[PDB]
Design an enzyme around this catalytic site. Sequence first.
Site, PDB file in Angstrom:
ATOM      1  N   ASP A 184       0.826  -1.206   0.000  1.00  0.00           N
ATOM      2  CA  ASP A 184       0.000   0.000   0.000  1.00  0.00           C
ATOM      3  C   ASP A 184       0.860   1.255   0.000  1.00  0.00           C
ATOM      4  OD1 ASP A 184      -2.860   1.232   1.935  1.00  0.00           O
ATOM      5  OD2 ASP A 184      -2.448   1.213  -0.225  1.00  0.00           O
TER       6      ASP A 184
ATOM      7  N   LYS B 148       2.040   4.711  -1.041  1.00  0.00           N
ATOM      8  CA  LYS B 148       1.482   5.931  -1.609  1.00  0.00           C
ATOM      9  C   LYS B 148       1.830   7.040  -0.627  1.00  0.00           C
ATOM     10  CE  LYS B 148      -3.016   4.780   0.350  1.00  0.00           C
ATOM     11  NZ  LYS B 148      -4.487   4.810   0.141  1.00  0.00           N
TER      12      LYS B 148
ATOM     13  N   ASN C 164       0.509   7.039   3.000  1.00  0.00           N
ATOM     14  CA  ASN C 164       0.962   6.075   3.990  1.00  0.00           C
ATOM     15  C   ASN C 164       2.367   6.361   4.478  1.00  0.00           C
ATOM     16  OD1 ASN C 164      -1.479   4.816   4.075  1.00  0.00           O
ATOM     17  ND2 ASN C 164      -0.883   3.054   2.817  1.00  0.00           N
TER      18      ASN C 164
ATOM     19  N   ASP D 205       0.069   2.290   8.278  1.00  0.00           N
ATOM     20  CA  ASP D 205      -1.048   1.619   7.608  1.00  0.00           C
ATOM     21  C   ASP D 205      -0.606   0.328   6.929  1.00  0.00           C
ATOM     22  OD1 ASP D 205      -3.708   2.614   5.257  1.00  0.00           O
ATOM     23  OD2 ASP D 205      -3.399   0.810   6.455  1.00  0.00           O
TER      24      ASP D 205
ATOM     25  N   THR E 136      -4.270   0.722  -4.192  1.00  0.00           N
ATOM     26  CA  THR E 136      -4.814   1.892  -4.865  1.00  0.00           C
ATOM     27  C   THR E 136      -4.562   1.757  -6.363  1.00  0.00           C
ATOM     28  OG1 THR E 136      -4.272   3.189  -2.896  1.00  0.00           O
ATOM     29  CG2 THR E 136      -4.853   4.405  -4.887  1.00  0.00           C
TER      30      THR E 136
HETATM   31  N1  LIG Z   1       1.503   6.456  14.523  1.00  0.00           N
HETATM   32  C1  LIG Z   1       0.879   7.562  14.108  1.00  0.00           C
HETATM   33  N2  LIG Z   1       1.407   8.765  14.436  1.00  0.00           N
HETATM   34  C2  LIG Z   1       0.789   9.874  14.019  1.00  0.00           C
HETATM   35  N3  LIG Z   1      -0.327   9.987  13.297  1.00  0.00           N
HETATM   36  C3  LIG Z   1      -0.824   8.784  12.986  1.00  0.00           C
HETATM   37  C4  LIG Z   1      -0.304   7.553  13.346  1.00  0.00           C
HETATM   38  N4  LIG Z   1      -1.088   6.522  12.851  1.00  0.00           N
HETATM   39  C5  LIG Z   1      -2.050   7.145  12.212  1.00  0.00           C
HETATM   40  N5  LIG Z   1      -1.962   8.511  12.264  1.00  0.00           N
HETATM   41  C6  LIG Z   1      -2.854   9.487  11.647  1.00  0.00           C
HETATM   42  O1  LIG Z   1      -4.148   8.923  11.562  1.00  0.00           O
HETATM   43  C7  LIG Z   1      -4.483   8.635  10.187  1.00  0.00           C
HETATM   44  C8  LIG Z   1      -5.126   7.271  10.104  1.00  0.00           C
HETATM   45  O2  LIG Z   1      -4.081   6.280  10.000  1.00  0.00           O
HETATM   46  P1  LIG Z   1      -4.296   4.895   9.256  1.00  0.00           P
HETATM   47  O3  LIG Z   1      -3.233   3.871   9.669  1.00  0.00           O
HETATM   48  O4  LIG Z   1      -4.326   5.151   7.793  1.00  0.00           O
HETATM   49  O5  LIG Z   1      -5.677   4.329   9.796  1.00  0.00           O
HETATM   50  P2  LIG Z   1      -6.850   4.011   8.820  1.00  0.00           P
HETATM   51  O6  LIG Z   1      -7.801   2.995   9.517  1.00  0.00           O
HETATM   52  O7  LIG Z   1      -6.332   3.392   7.563  1.00  0.00           O
HETATM   53  N6  LIG Z   1      -7.671   5.439   8.496  1.00  0.00           N
HETATM   54  P3  LIG Z   1      -7.919   5.715   6.842  1.00  0.00           P
HETATM   55  O8  LIG Z   1      -6.527   5.927   6.131  1.00  0.00           O
HETATM   56  O9  LIG Z   1      -8.794   7.023   6.674  1.00  0.00           O
HETATM   57  O10 LIG Z   1      -8.635   4.557   6.220  1.00  0.00           O
HETATM   58  C9  LIG Z   1      -3.178   8.785   9.410  1.00  0.00           C
HETATM   59  O11 LIG Z   1      -3.402   9.196   8.066  1.00  0.00           O
HETATM   60  C10 LIG Z   1      -2.432   9.845  10.220  1.00  0.00           C
HETATM   61  O12 LIG Z   1      -2.806  11.177   9.879  1.00  0.00           O
HETATM   62 MN   LIG Z   2      -3.923   5.254   5.151  1.00  0.00          MN
HETATM   63 MN   LIG Z   3      -5.797   3.532   5.435  1.00  0.00          MN
END
Ligand SMILES: Nc1ncnc2c1ncn2[C@@H]1O[C@H](COP(=O)(O)OP(=O)(O)NP(=O)(O)O)[C@@H](O)[C@H]1O
Ligand SMILES: [Mn+2]
Ligand SMILES: [Mn+2]
Length: 336
Positions: free
Chosen positions: A149, A151, A154, A167, A186
């Site tokens: 994934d 991009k 991430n 992610d 994606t």
């Molecule tokens: N370890 C971290 N430190 C700081 N910010 C974080 C962290 N993990 C996640 N985030 C923030 O929270 C968002 C969500 O993280 P993600 O791992 O992509 O969860 P998700 O379930 O996939 N949400 P989404 O991408 O909308 O589907 C990220 O895009 C960051 O902006």
């Molecule tokens: Mn994400």
């Molecule tokens: Mn995600």
Amino acid sequence: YEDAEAKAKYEAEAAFFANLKLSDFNIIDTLGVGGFGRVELVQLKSEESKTFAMKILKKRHIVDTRQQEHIRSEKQIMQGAHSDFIVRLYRTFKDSKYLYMLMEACLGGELWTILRDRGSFEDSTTRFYTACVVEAFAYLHSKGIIYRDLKPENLILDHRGYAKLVDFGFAKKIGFGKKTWTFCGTPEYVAPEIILNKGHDISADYWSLGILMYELLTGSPPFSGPDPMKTYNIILRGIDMIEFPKKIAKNAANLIKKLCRDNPSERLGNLKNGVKDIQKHKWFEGFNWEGLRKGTLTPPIIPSVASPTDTSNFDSFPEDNDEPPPDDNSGWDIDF
Ligand SMILES: Nc1ncnc2c1ncn2[C@@H]1O[C@H](COP(=O)(O)OP(=O)(O)NP(=O)(O)O)[C@@H](O)[C@H]1O
Ligand SMILES: [Mn+2]
Ligand SMILES: [Mn+2]
């Protein structure tokens, strides 16, 4: 483990977190929201200098979207990974409604919004971030794990400006000599062997690395159509049919074309010396890989983070006022 010192460090760290409970944390502020749940900045009550990103997921949303295997794999891979270029997952918690994943906080902010605000990254900037990903991939691929994934969305910055993979929802451990078969990712970033359902392995990641370079250098990925079907046809036509703008340095274009080979077995990174062949490509001439791994290299974009509780590099979100999701006791979360 790299060595016995590292083995002992990670075992000591695991024993430190195994003793913790959810009640040991204070909520500082929200880092991200969505239908999936929230990511909260949390603080260790006994050591206020230790803050973490706690991803809190509504279990019902995971079940509805058929992502149980994805989140279980995310936990296993992320909790088992020990790389400075991958967000650490220290441990998990659970209750009847939520899963809680206690991760390393990266307070520098999201890379994708910076990319949007600048339009594109200069060559040296792109080279730094690409190298961060190259190191993360070296680690994962040495353990037989595809990331799947890649991009800009991430990639997240810590307080220094170092980029880390976040992610792992599509990441998968693939058995030796095996391929995996799920059409996911994606559309602009999916490799042709995924489109053609021929099975894919870690070499798909090298394809994605090429896409990333192109996107970072120009603001957009090289293959794009009005709908995913036209995009897939464009991808199947190959990278040699894509126009490389003069903005892209010649060495960068060469590297991108070697990463985006139609045949996965011919992709740079998948050849004789693995990821080392990427690291020795002429585009990285003068790049201090040892300094990157040591943290001595100066990042191209310095976020300023005043303290472990500073969330100024993230959007603001009102605290959660949504209805609590239904209980989820099916039992797929035993290991959490
Ligand atoms: N370890 C971290 N430190 C700081 N910010 C974080 C962290 N993990 C996640 N985030 C923030 O929270 C968002 C969500 O993280 P993600 O791992 O992509 O969860 P998700 O379930 O996939 N949400 P989404 O991408 O909308 O589907 C990220 O895009 C960051 O902006
Ligand atoms: Mn994400
Ligand atoms: Mn995600």
